[PDB]
């Protein structure tokens with residue numbers, strides 16, 4: 003529903019048990035030290051992201067706990083969590099399925115990919131599987147537009163997707179095998195399918211085209 | 217050592233972890249010089 | 262010596278450098294329409310109604326934030342500015358709820374009055390309006406958040422004149438809502454002042470809620486006695502009864518605010 | 525004296541020789557390809573020479589602005605004022621059709637950090653905050669690996685490249701937003717608050733990140749900055765039309781046989797670029813219906829304009845559009861133009877930060893109206909109403925997102941109004 007008002011529930015309550023592991027704590031202080039002294043509030047976005055990693059989804063306790071360590075008032079922490087899309091204020095199921103639906107990737111029939119996921123999973127767009135393995139939602143442009151329709155499984159890009167190719171990806175996740183990041187075609191990253199129309203010569207060594215002066 | 221233009225040697229991103237970005241950021245902290253101080257400890261303090 | 266010179270509607274005006282366009286226009290007497298810009302609070306720019314045309318300049322500038330410089334002719338009543346004001350208000354009234362007969366701000370609503378002066382006489386918005394769930398922030402403040410225009414005046418007041426940071430804006434886009442996320446009463450000795458700064462009926466007073474209309478009350482100046490500060494107030498009386506105690510302006514004693522125990 | 529037949533660049537002058545990841549993207553490969561070479565001499569030349577050679581290069585902002593990058597970077601030639609000086613590299617790449625920033629980061633990151641290093645020296649900055657978008661986690665980790673390699677090699681850090689300068693690069697990840705691509709919003713999001721853009725009576729050169737001076741620069745612009753220093757502005761100025769120099773990347777996507785990326789010389793014919801690098805429009809060039817020149821913000825142009833138009837700033841400006849980010853999206857005759865544009869407005873509505881009224885309410889209103897247009901449930905008078913609405917939000921918003929969302933509607937209306945008329949008539953007689 004993407005509602006922006008948190009109502010207290012037994013699952014998501016300010017008393018929900020959450021904290022930071024000691025390894026997470028040293029990561030947090032390294033994050034804060036990246037920013038100038040006196041403006042440690044700048045670490046809100048990365049630190050709040052850290053709470054996401056060790057919890058999957060951040061409850062209100064995680065957003066409160068971020069406020070205490072960073073001295074930021076909880077209201078400002080709540081603003082960041084609701085504004086940015088990645089922060090999952092509601093629990094998600096293991097592998098997060100993000101499908102591009104913007105025009106450049108839809109022009110190459112991205113809905114076929116979305117339909118293929120819908121058929122294999124059986125879960126309608128938006129909800130989560132009963133075994134909490136896949137969470138299928140649609141997302142806007144993710145950069146890789148020159149590549150064919152793609153997904154954003156957890157933290158991996160799977161480009162040049164094709165309706166049967168994503169069937170292989172889904173069962174690999176169902177069996178625990180990790181699909182290889184990258185396009186599911188002959189193209190490696192972004193090169194033309196037919197062949198390299200440029201950069202077909204060894205790059206020139208140091209000093210090439212370098213003026214006398216510098 | 218050829219002009220192996222048919223190989224995508226950038227495969228290191230495959231075997232990455234959930235904490236990889238923050239991990240090597242922590243290891244990278246010692247190189248960073250001391251940050252400037254704005255005086256007060258916080259804009260509210 | 263530092264005073265730079267500007268031309269408000271052509272007439273020369275002496276302005277301290279760093280003065281915003283809006284204050285320069287006020288020097289002549291023209292009051293630029295505004296929603297977000299409150300004099301005491303900071304300047305934000307969400308209002309977008311303070312837009313005005315600077316002469317020989319293609320882009321309409323926001324008078325609430327632009328500092329003037331040498332030789333500027335602030336064309337307040339230029340056609341481009343008037344088209345800008347009508348456009349901005351059209352967006353404001355696009356999703357506003359039809360609550361004027363039942364809204365306490367009726368008769369003293371800045372959105373209502375600025376619609377009469379700087380705004381169109383109809384609507385071309387044949388869509389479905391938005392609705393936002395109400396929030397509770399205490400037994401003092403009426404909160405009909407569907408009428409809010411996200412001027413962030415309440416947010417600025419809470420974080421500047423009140424000191425407590427519990428009012429904010431959650432979400433992005435048109436679905437952005439101003440409130441407190443987790444349910445919590447906005448309680449402070451200056452809490453009731455958010456009723457005054459809010460230009461619409463989104464935040465009104467529960468005790469007085471829909472018991473009188475602004476055009477029918479008689480305003481009588483007086484001095485508060487609840488505290489020793491002696492804040493100047495405007496006691497509004499109708500038919501020999503007391504409904505509202507509104508703050509007055511003194512710029513020394515109470516600025517533009519009163520305590521809740523006063524109100 | 526004039527290379528009128530602009531285009532068909534050769535591999536020698538290409539900047540990102542490791543664009544497709546066909547060579548070692550670590551420090552060893554980058555130095556092999558010609559990176560981190562005589563960097564100290566660039567540092568010792570002095571910031572004035574770095575700025576001066578950028579003006580000679582005529583480099584324009586390759587991020588959607590096209591500003592005279594030399595003039596912009598000259599804004600911190602002012603003396604010190606106690607406050608620290610900071611540099612910021614934009615790496616959000618949230619505009620649809622834009623993929624160039626992703627490729628340089630994950631295939632030639634060492635050029636980027638060197639770009640921050642020479643860029644910071646020219647502008648006197650203390651550190652560079654590369655704001656990579658949150659989705660590019662693998663790219664960010666790849667970027668940090670290069671940073672660690674540079675730190676160990678002594679190129680960056682205390683006494684950077686053995687030149688006395690102390691420069692650091694913090695790569696800050698995003699949390700998911702297209703508005704974070706905006707410079708002032710990016711400055712805002714770095715500070716930790718909501719990613720709403722800030723008004724500019726002030727400018728990042730004076731007030732910026734943490735209040736200190738800053739300058740948001742695109743990844744491509746900073747990446748090519750060191751090579752400009754090595755090869756000179758004269759070498760860079762040789763390519764491209766006047767005021768249109770450089771070798772801007774191109775992200776071709778849509779209804780093409782092989783959508784791809786190529787670093788082609790600027791002011792290239794649009795037909796030529798699609799034919800060879802991309803492979804031509806699916807179903808032949810005659811199957812083309814419309815093309816997005818430089819991303820969603822840039823208005824579309826029909827095939828008639830597509831017949832002969834040079835891919836640059838000025839040539840597209842007189843073609844009722846803009847270069848933007850050089851994100852060429854083609855749309856064949858099998859493409860529902862109205863549906864495609866409605867999706868773009870849907871993307872903009874889902875990405876507007878909601879701060880200013882015209883972008884908060886106008887884009888949502890334009891989304892609802894365009895949705896009716898796709899179904900045809902409207903009247904011909906609504907087309908004119910959509911035109912007026914798009915103009916009302918144009919130039920009245922805090923950031924250029926409102927103008928970035930109004931332009932596609934203006935582009936669609938002025939080039940495909942008969943298509944809109946036919947659909948509404950089709951809806952009318954069907955529902956009789």
Ligand SMILES: Cc1cc2nc3c(=O)[nH]c(=O)nc-3n(C[C@H](O)[C@H](O)[C@H](O)COP(=O)(O)O)c2cc1C
Nearest residue numbers: 585587614616617618705706707740741742924925
């Ligand atoms: C909505 C919006 C999104 C933008 N996204 C980006 C972006 O992803 N990358 C970028 O380099 N510039 C982006 N820009 C442009 C920046 O605001 C800014 O003009 C530019 O980054 C400055 O660097 P440049 O001169 O090298 O282009 C965006 C602007 C707007 C209004």
Ligand code: SF4
Nearest residue numbers: 360361364367370462
């Ligand atoms: S706030 Fe103003 S416009 Fe809205 S219902 Fe009340 S009187 Fe009418």
Ligand code: SF4
Nearest residue numbers: 409410412413415459
């Ligand atoms: S509740 Fe009132 S003061 Fe607060 S943002 Fe909305 S209109 Fe402004």
Ligand code: SF4
Nearest residue numbers: 877878879880883921
């Ligand atoms: S145009 Fe949209 S994104 Fe930009 S400041 Fe205004 S509301 Fe925010």
Ligand code: FES
Nearest residue numbers: 102106107143144
């Ligand atoms: S278009 Fe599908 S990711 Fe941008």
Ligand code: FES
Nearest residue numbers: 306308309311325
């Ligand atoms: S008064 Fe300047 S924007 Fe509202």
Ligand SMILES: [K+]
Nearest residue numbers: 456459461464
């Ligand atoms: K009010």
